[PDB]
Amino acid sequence: MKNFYDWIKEFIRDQGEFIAQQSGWLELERSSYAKLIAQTISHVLNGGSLLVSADSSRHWFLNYILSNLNPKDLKERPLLSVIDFNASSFYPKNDANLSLATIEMTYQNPMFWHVGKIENEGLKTILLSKIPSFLWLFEELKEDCLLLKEHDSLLDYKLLQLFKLFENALFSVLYNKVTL
Amino acid sequence: MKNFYDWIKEFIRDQGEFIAQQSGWLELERSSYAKLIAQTISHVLNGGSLLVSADSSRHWFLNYILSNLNPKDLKERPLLSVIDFNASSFYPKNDANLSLATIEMTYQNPMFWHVGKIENEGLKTILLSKIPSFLWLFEELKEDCLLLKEHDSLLDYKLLQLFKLFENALFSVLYNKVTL
Amino acid sequence: MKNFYDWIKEFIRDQGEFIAQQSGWLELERSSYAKLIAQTISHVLNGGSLLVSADSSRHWFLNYILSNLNPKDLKERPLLSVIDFNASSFYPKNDANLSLATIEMTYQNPMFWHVGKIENEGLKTILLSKIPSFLWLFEELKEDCLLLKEHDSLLDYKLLQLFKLFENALFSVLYNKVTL
Amino acid sequence: MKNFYDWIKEFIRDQGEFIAQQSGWLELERSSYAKLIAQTISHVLNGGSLLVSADSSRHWFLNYILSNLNPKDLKERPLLSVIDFNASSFYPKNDANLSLATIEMTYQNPMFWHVGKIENEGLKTILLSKIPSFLWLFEELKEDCLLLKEHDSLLDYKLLQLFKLFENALFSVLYNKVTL
Amino acid sequence: NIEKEILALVKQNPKVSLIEYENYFSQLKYNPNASKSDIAFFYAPNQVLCTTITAKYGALLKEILSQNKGMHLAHSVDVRIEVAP
Amino acid sequence: NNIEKEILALVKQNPKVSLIEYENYFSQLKYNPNASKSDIAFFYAPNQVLCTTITAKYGALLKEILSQNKVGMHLAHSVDVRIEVAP
Amino acid sequence: NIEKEILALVKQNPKVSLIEYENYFSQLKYNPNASKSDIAFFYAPNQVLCTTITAKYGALLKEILSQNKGMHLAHSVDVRIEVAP
Amino acid sequence: NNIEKEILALVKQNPKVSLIEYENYFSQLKYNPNASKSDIAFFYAPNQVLCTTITAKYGALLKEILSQNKVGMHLAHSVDVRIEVAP
Ligand SMILES: [Cl-]
Ligand SMILES: [Cl-]
Ligand SMILES: [Cl-]
Ligand SMILES: [Cl-]
Ligand SMILES: [Cl-]
Ligand SMILES: [Cl-]
Ligand SMILES: [Cl-]
Ligand SMILES: [Cl-]
Ligand SMILES: [Cl-]
Ligand SMILES: [Cl-]
Ligand SMILES: [Cl-]
Ligand SMILES: [Cl-]
Ligand code: NA
Ligand code: NA
Ligand code: NA
Ligand code: NA
Ligand code: NA
Ligand code: NA
Ligand code: NA
Ligand code: NA
Ligand code: NA
Ligand code: NA
Ligand code: NA
Ligand code: NA
Ligand code: NA
Ligand code: NA
Ligand code: NA
Ligand code: NA
Ligand code: NA
Ligand code: NA
Ligand code: NA
Ligand code: NA
Structure with missing residues (x-):
């Protein structure tokens, strides 16, 4: 076989290279993704709320979203209206209609921010509802979504980047550094 | 230095007896507990929501509240507007004022249902706010509160009972079996 | 209909009464339950570990077990070797054999403490394994278990009592107040 | 006061570029990172276990570690002995000595894999213990550590990369594709 | 008020x-x-009643109503339930 | 429009901001x-969000600052502040 | 060592x-x-290999072995895998 | 058997216990x-559990207490303590 120490060395280079190589992915291909962010931003700046859900492979990312939008030390940031909707009682299982009615009744202005596989018919039904969404999907459930290669080896990195893009965009407009 | 098997026997009897002995406790003190339930019930039947929090000794009871109000198999029950506010992003730490503003902005009609020790100034401040509450406390922060002996050996049992009393009371009125 | 305030009053009395009425349940009927506790206690005092799992209706009780065995303020108590096995990576889904092998490899002396419905074939398989158990079941999977009426209106209270019985028994023997 | 749509465009390019630009970072510093992986790998291949903890800014990464080492669909992979030690009862608070004794007693062969800030004296004390570790730190508590720029804008990306490097390295040797 | 026989069609319905x-x-x-x-x-x-009913039976009610004969000589009568005062 | 301009300077010029x-x-x-x-x-x-965050974190600062100064916001030895959204 | 043809029976097996x-x-x-x-x-x-193999293929190996012909003239040969030194 | 008895009194008689x-x-x-x-x-x-808890929370107290006293556990200006389980 090949020595681990030589192995790890080669490996480290391809890894970093492949990364640089793909760095442009998002701009190459720039989408409607801007308008989604736009609308989501408007949504949020209008006081609406963000009910975040994720497929079972992306819990770590739901977590990431929650702690990066509202970090332990807020400093002078807003407290952003963000809900871990995965963990919520209203997360649809049997009867999205009740999930949906209750949700509409509890919140003033909810929006669904879902990321990844739609793993049940309950959630499909709600994301197809008329409540505002922010769909980061592997398959275009709907016109207005952000499409993502599921089996991409760099999927995990692009979620950060996109989030980071989203976080920056939202605060750049909240803080009047940019005109939406 | 007494046999375990004889020990466990004696122990089992005192245990059960002590329980029977105290069974009446709640009726044998019927404070304004009824009106709180009344108001809370009205609150809920008006569509308001229930943001549940608990001291760190009573997580198990927050859990209990959440799964008993909205059980896995709802059957024909409502989906009740119940929020685990302990786990929420708005749970007050540094700046209850933001917690409070953002909470008021997200929800249509929140109510705080807190149980146990008020372990920080953040939470004290909110429970003293003017948002509707349902206080199950060890010390009377406020007059419309339900007072509980903290060091009671039967505390744990009385939480179930009270909850059960609450759940029954709410559904007895929702279902028009009783007139509030 | 009937007035809520008169309703709640009647209700409160039956509730407390029914409780007193059933207080003896555990002694009436005393079981093999003592020997289970005995063995479990021996298990624990021998340094073995307690992997706790619960059916989806009893999360609150798993929580209760975890926080009551190892309370925030330990005082002078031991740190007891207790694992929330529900939340663990080894909790069996597809392939109890791997769950089981890994479990046996990671821990020195595990024991399964399960409570409630056995909701999958993975868990059934492990609880039938030869690793030591402490079965609080609704149906006698195995000779050595503690049987519980599932649909008992006082189920919730009896879990506390039993736990409390268990906690007391274990510390009464650890502290040499009683001879096992 | 620059248009959002032009803004987002510029932003997207710098973002991707900066990423490509830094792509080499890891190879461009190849510290003793290799030997740590080596030893950790040996540790794991010898059956030892991995008790994972993370500072409160990196929960998402603990989550990531847990679900990537043991994915929902294992396929033909091992079940790897990985523990979320953050959520464990033994996580040291007041008395690392008990944490440490009980940990040593429960597990056959534990190793601490910690990532990020050491936020209490309890955890410092254990990571300084003699139990095997895998330290991903912001400050060198110890010499066999992997050092990380805390305030790096690309910190989040490098955690994935390193993990990915680790996961690959471990399976490349477990599967005899590489000689350690 | 006699028009409340609406309830008997409902009572008399399978899916309820x-x-x-x-x-x-x-x-x-x-x-x-x-x-x-x-x-x-x-x-x-x-x-809660206005909402739960609407959510779980609104279609049942629309249905039932459209499929029967007062002041609903529509092929497809809509149902709207509300709270009282 | 002139008052606007200058309310802001009292704020800019304030310690706790x-x-x-x-x-x-x-x-x-x-x-x-x-x-x-x-x-x-x-x-x-x-x-x-601005109307809300500002109000939550600085409303008292503004009430304060205002009461403690002349403006064209008169007598009001205790002037209240109310911020809103635009259209 | 020639006896390692054990591997070819395994390679040649359906369930692997x-x-x-x-x-x-x-x-x-x-x-x-x-x-x-x-x-x-x-x-x-x-x-890990000794354990994973044992856990997921031990029965396959017992099987395969019992169902074939050296130093295993048993109707039901048991398999035991271990680590090296 | 006599030493036993009396090691315990030094412990009983100690402040931090x-x-x-x-x-x-x-x-x-x-x-x-x-x-x-x-x-x-x-x-x-x-x-x-006793062998372990004691060792974890009082082992240093015992080492201490012991080193600072005569016993029949001699010289050892620093006597080590080792507690175990019985059979
Ligand atoms: Cl879920
Ligand atoms: Cl809209
Ligand atoms: Cl909390
Ligand atoms: Cl505090
Ligand atoms: Cl308590
Ligand atoms: Cl007690
Ligand atoms: Cl589970
Ligand atoms: Cl045994
Ligand atoms: Cl922690
Ligand atoms: Cl600390
Ligand atoms: Cl950071
Ligand atoms: Cl940035
Ligand atoms: Na819109
Ligand atoms: Na999911
Ligand atoms: Na992933
Ligand atoms: Na790829
Ligand atoms: Na960025
Ligand atoms: Na960020
Ligand atoms: Na600047
Ligand atoms: Na919520
Ligand atoms: Na906060
Ligand atoms: Na208080
Ligand atoms: Na035994
Ligand atoms: Na379960
Ligand atoms: Na229950
Ligand atoms: Na019953
Ligand atoms: Na007791
Ligand atoms: Na207790
Ligand atoms: Na005593
Ligand atoms: Na564990
Ligand atoms: Na601790
Ligand atoms: Na440090």
């Missing part, structure tokens, strides 16, 4: 159990003010 | 002489 | 994929010391 | 003159 009729539908009440040959208006005592 | 805080928040605030006068001051914020 | 043979079984090695006509002993380089 | 701590823990400890001597003291505890 006795407890469902009791706990929910019995509490419903008709609104001949508002209510206009293409809609039926009902009152429910409170919000 | 940092430069970034003034920039990110206060600069975006704008005065409402319709509605204003004189036991209250009305300001507009471009959007809801 | 090429990657499974490669990642796991190829790394296995026979132990004619120990190993006694009612058991077969194999070595695996390390503990 | 409460009555319940002595009762729940230390009283159950017992001396091991086989194995003991004299740079180490060996004690038995009835079971593993």
Whole structure:
């Protein structure tokens, strides 16, 4: 076989290279993704709320979203209206209609921010509802979504980047550094 | 230095007896507990929501509240507007004022249902706010509160009972079996 | 209909009464339950570990077990070797054999403490394994278990009592107040 | 006061570029990172276990570690002995000595894999213990550590990369594709 | 008020159990003010009822109504339930 | 429009408010002489989150600052502040 | 050593994929010391392999072995895999 | 057997050990003159959790207490303590 120490060395280079190589992915291909962010931003700046859900492979990312939008030390940031909707009682299982009615009744202005596989018919039904969404999907459930290669080896990195893009965009407009 | 098997026997009897002995406790003190339930019930039947929090000794009871109000198999029950506010992003730490503003902005009609020790100034401040509450406390922060002996050996049992009393009371009125 | 305030009053009395009425349940009927506790206690005092799992209706009780065995303020108590096995990576889904092998490899002396419905074939398989158990079941999977009426209106209270019985028994023997 | 749509465009390019630009970072510093992986790998291949903890800014990464080492669909992979030690009862608070004794007693062969800030004296004390570790730190508590720029804008990306490097390295040797 | 025989069509319907009729539908009440040959208006005592009923039986009610004969000579009568005062 | 300008300087010039805080928040605030006068001051914020965050974290600072100064927001030995969204 | 044709029966078996043979079984090695006509002993380089193999293929191996003909003239030969030194 | 008895009194009589701590823990400890001597003291505890908890929370107290006293555990200006389970 090949020595681990030589192995790890080669490996480290391809890894970093492949990364640089793909760095442009998002701009190459720039989408409607801007308008989604736009609308989501408007949504949020209008006081609406963000009910975040994720497929079972992306819990770590739901977590990431929650702690990066509202970090332990807020400093002078807003407290952003963000809900871990995965963990919520209203997360649809049997009867999205009740999930949906209750949700509409509890919140003033909810929006669904879902990321990844739609793993049940309950959630499909709600994301197809008329409540505002922010769909980061592997398959275009709907016109207005952000499409993502599921089996991409760099999927995990692009979620950060996109989030980071989203976080920056939202605060750049909240803080009047940019005109939406 | 007494046999375990004889020990466990004696122990089992005192245990059960002590329980029977105290069974009446709640009726044998019927404070304004009824009106709180009344108001809370009205609150809920008006569509308001229930943001549940608990001291760190009573997580198990927050859990209990959440799964008993909205059980896995709802059957024909409502989906009740119940929020685990302990786990929420708005749970007050540094700046209850933001917690409070953002909470008021997200929800249509929140109510705080807190149980146990008020372990920080953040939470004290909110429970003293003017948002509707349902206080199950060890010390009377406020007059419309339900007072509980903290060091009671039967505390744990009385939480179930009270909850059960609450759940029954709410559904007895929702279902028009009783007139509030 | 009937007035809520008169309703709640009647209700409160039956509730407390029914409780007193059933207080003896555990002694009436005393079981093999003592020997289970005995063995479990021996298990624990021998340094073995307690992997706790619960059916989806009893999360609150798993929580209760975890926080009551190892309370925030330990005082002078031991740190007891207790694992929330529900939340663990080894909790069996597809392939109890791997769950089981890994479990046996990671821990020195595990024991399964399960409570409630056995909701999958993975868990059934492990609880039938030869690793030591402490079965609080609704149906006698195995000779050595503690049987519980599932649909008992006082189920919730009896879990506390039993736990409390268990906690007391274990510390009464650890502290040499009683001879096992 | 620059248009959002032009803004987002510029932003997207710098973002991707900066990423490509830094792509080499890891190879461009190849510290003793290799030997740590080596030893950790040996540790794991010898059956030892991995008790994972993370500072409160990196929960998402603990989550990531847990679900990537043991994915929902294992396929033909091992079940790897990985523990979320953050959520464990033994996580040291007041008395690392008990944490440490009980940990040593429960597990056959534990190793601490910690990532990020050491936020209490309890955890410092254990990571300084003699139990095997895998330290991903912001400050060198110890010499066999992997050092990380805390305030790096690309910190989040490098955690994935390193993990990915680790996961690959471990399976490349477990599967005899590489000689350690 | 006689028009409340609406409840008997409901009671008499397959997809609705006795407890469902009791706990929910019995509490419903008709609104001949508002209510206009293409809609039926009902009152429910409170919000949760207005919402739960609407969510779980609104279609049942639309259905039932459209499929039967007062002030609903529509092929497809809509149902709107509300809270009382 | 002149008062606007200058309310902001009292704020800028205040101890418990940092430069970034003034920039990110206060600069975006704008005065409402319709509605204003004189036991209250009305300001507009471009959007809801700003109207809410500002109000939550600086409303007391503004009440304060205002009461402790002359303006054209008169007597009101205790002038109240109310900020809102624009259209 | 010639006795390692054990691997070809495994390779040649339905319920075992090429990657499974490669990642796991190829790394296995026979132990004619120990190993006694009612058991077969194999070595695996390390503990995880010894454990995972044992957990997921031990029965496959018992099987395969019992169903074939050296020093295993048993109707039901047991398999025991171990780590090396 | 006499030493046993009296090691316990030094412990009982010690500041940083409460009555319940002595009762729940230390009283159950017992001396091991086989194995003991004299740079180490060996004690038995009835079971593993006791052997472990005691060792974790009081091992240093015992080392201490022992080094700072005569016993029949000699010279050892720094006597080590080792507690174990019984059979
Ligand atoms: Cl979920
Ligand atoms: Cl809209
Ligand atoms: Cl909390
Ligand atoms: Cl505090
Ligand atoms: Cl308590
Ligand atoms: Cl007690
Ligand atoms: Cl589970
Ligand atoms: Cl055994
Ligand atoms: Cl923690
Ligand atoms: Cl600390
Ligand atoms: Cl950071
Ligand atoms: Cl940035
Ligand atoms: Na819109
Ligand atoms: Na999911
Ligand atoms: Na992933
Ligand atoms: Na790829
Ligand atoms: Na960025
Ligand atoms: Na960020
Ligand atoms: Na919520
Ligand atoms: Na906060
Ligand atoms: Na208090
Ligand atoms: Na045994
Ligand atoms: Na479960
Ligand atoms: Na229950
Ligand atoms: Na019953
Ligand atoms: Na008790
Ligand atoms: Na207890
Ligand atoms: Na564990
Ligand atoms: Na601790
Ligand atoms: Na440090
Ligand atoms: Na700047
Ligand atoms: Na006593």
